[PDB]
Design a protein around this nucleic acid. Sequence first.
RNA 1: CACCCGUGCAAAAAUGCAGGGGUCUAAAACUGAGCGGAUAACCUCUCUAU
RNA 2: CAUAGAGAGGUUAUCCGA
Length: 835
Amino acid sequence: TKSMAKAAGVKSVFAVGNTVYMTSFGRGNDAVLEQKIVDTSHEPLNIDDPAYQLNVVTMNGYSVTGHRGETVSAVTDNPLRRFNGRKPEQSVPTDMLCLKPTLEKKFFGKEFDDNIHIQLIYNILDIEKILAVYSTNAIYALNNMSADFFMKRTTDETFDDFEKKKESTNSREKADFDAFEKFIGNYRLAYFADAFYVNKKNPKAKNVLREDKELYSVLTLIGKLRHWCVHSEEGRAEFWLYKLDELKDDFKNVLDVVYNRPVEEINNRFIENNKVNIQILGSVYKNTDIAELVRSYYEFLITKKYKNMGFSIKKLRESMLEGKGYADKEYDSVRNKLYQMTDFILYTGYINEDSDRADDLVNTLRSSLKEDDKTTVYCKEADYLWKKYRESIREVADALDGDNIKKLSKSNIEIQEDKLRKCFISYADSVSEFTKLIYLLTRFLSGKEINDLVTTLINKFDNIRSFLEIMDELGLDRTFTAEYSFFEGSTKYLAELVELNSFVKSCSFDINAKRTMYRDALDILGIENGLRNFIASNVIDSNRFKYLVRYGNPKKIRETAKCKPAVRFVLNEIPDAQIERYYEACCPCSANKRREKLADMIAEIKFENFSDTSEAEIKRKNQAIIRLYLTVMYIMLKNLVNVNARYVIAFHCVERDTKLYAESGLEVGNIEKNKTNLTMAVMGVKLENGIIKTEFDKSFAENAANRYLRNARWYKLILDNLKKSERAVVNEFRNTVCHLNAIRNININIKEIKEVENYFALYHYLIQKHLENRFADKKVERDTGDFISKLEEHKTYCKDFVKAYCTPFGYNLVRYKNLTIDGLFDKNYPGKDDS
RNA sequence: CACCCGUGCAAAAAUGCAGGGGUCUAAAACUGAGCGGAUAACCUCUCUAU
RNA sequence: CAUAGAGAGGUUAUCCGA
Ligand SMILES: [Mg+2]
């Protein structure tokens, strides 16, 4: 169940000096101060419209009782007594990595004797983590077409300086320029059309490649983003993301050109596309002015302002209109627009008059301790919503049902348009460089990744804004240092990101390149009259083909489709009803038997199977097989990439905390030579002649750098794993994770697997096979040899090897546990702890 | 069935009960979002064809 | 500038399994 304190209305508890402050939830992700306690002495802020009242206040915590919605009473622990019980004074808590003073001194001027700034700093760190992961994914997608260049690319040089490599007398950069030249002109550049292709007029319009300057600028921006996020830059370059206004003119121009296209393609046709909707709404909103109504419609549909009010308008409308038989065939043709107008009416009803009703609904939602209440309150609200808006819904339905009158209302243009355009999407000349760079980064990833990245950024920026508002209200110092003053405008950035969330979609395949992708689509199934044209047409339009090609070589995907255990596991993840539907679509008998038959059929898909009695039967069968194959391989590849993202997070965190600990005064040494120097430095052990001679002692655990390694058992376990690791193996693992070499070489690394129990096991088997292949002709330590022999003998990933080469993350115990023991890696598959 | 912290109780150096964690792990609450298919209208540029 | 028929893209629903 969820936290009862959060449901009671307690947002957070902040320790400032010897006093403590308790906040409350507000409109959206806002915070309101109402309670200050100084050693069992309570003073109430927010004298009017309170959120909760504290019953008993003690040094050990505070018991509170809420007033919003359900009167749920809970208890909250005192932050000033953290780490100070049964072992004897009040002190401001520190982060578990013992890096709070260093982070405060870095992002701000000095230490602040409170636990508010550190949360903002950790939100910034989360922003950097997610940016690192998705920039690494984008770089891998851009590099996959090769079937070095993207590592040394920096924005300090423009295309004019890069062009001097034509006559360069040194081969080191001549090879780089040759690689750049080979990059352009590649047919695989047809993907990512919005990043490399632009529309051109006939003197009809066709998509053509941009000039070399713009392509180089895009590549440089992406490469520098990856280099800055993944690595720990030193000097001015470490502020590259937060000083994007200092970029050269070429990069700004390419960012503006990339960003302006969707905006100019969305707000230009807004009036014409939704004409009938505004006409009907004006008919039913007789009193409201037309300009204000169209402004509200634009803010509701294009900007999608109905997805951040706290509740779900869609759920309320669904639970309201279900009673009346609008789901019947009678309104089948008009359902699409009628429902949209219903949600619009609901939205304008909750922002003009029923603001208090919306606040009550969101309060009841927040105070619920389970899922049963979250539906009962929705139904209760929907009853009143029906009883109030039945007439308006009926009027809209009858107006839309008049297809004759609908056509009569479509050919007449009387809308005021050149006035009140301030609601339109801001062009590239008004948005910040950070948002444009984020959009350019998103132009290289799949839609789910885009949604995850944008939502995470919006949430973190909202967190930063709320914390800044809290600090301003409390009177605390919040002036960032001169290098991070960008974050002072964070609120504005949040808006842009929210605005960016309105219209950002996946990338579009170029229309003219529909023939160049014929070979890739025809070869992803490994085929090689005119039936192959049908197969290519039915493969290209699949949404999973984009992911399968942008993130994998089609021939390699076809080769890895022969791994029967892997495909069998992916089919096992699919529920029984879906498997039955697939079998009935692909063929004219238990669930497991049908799953095995499907896994056998997909493994040797051939041209004979497609060719081989109605034309409306064999065509659907071939389509079903094609779509099933594409779905299976897409799921496998996507989950493998998502698993690799976690280790990308881990290595970025390792680099960042290495730099932070080195700044904090800990002798960590260089990290490029050995990636596990953080863990030894935190423990305090040294590589005496290449091995850790020191054994376990309780004193070493008692004097660890951070609270993570202050438990004797986990200290001993991680030290033992360290003594069983190898520097070269760790470096190769880091390179494989950062460059996604395991996923790229999936053809070979999956050849001789026996059984797959989860995606974690498959990914680590791939990595272990890659490590064995790279070290097949090199001298390795006895532990690595034992691990490789065990992997070869069992033909399954070795968990001890995972514990061995994941030791660089050992300084963070929770991350190490999550990334080593299977069953704790994925939150969607909660397993059992093996240790 | 993760990690850390608080409090009661058994102990004697750890078990249990009940909680908290934005300052632990992709990871605070409402919501936005991170799951997969199989059909539907409606708009735009046509492009022979009416 | 009506009906047949293609592509290619916008939003939007509703249906079952989680
Ligand atoms: Mg966090």
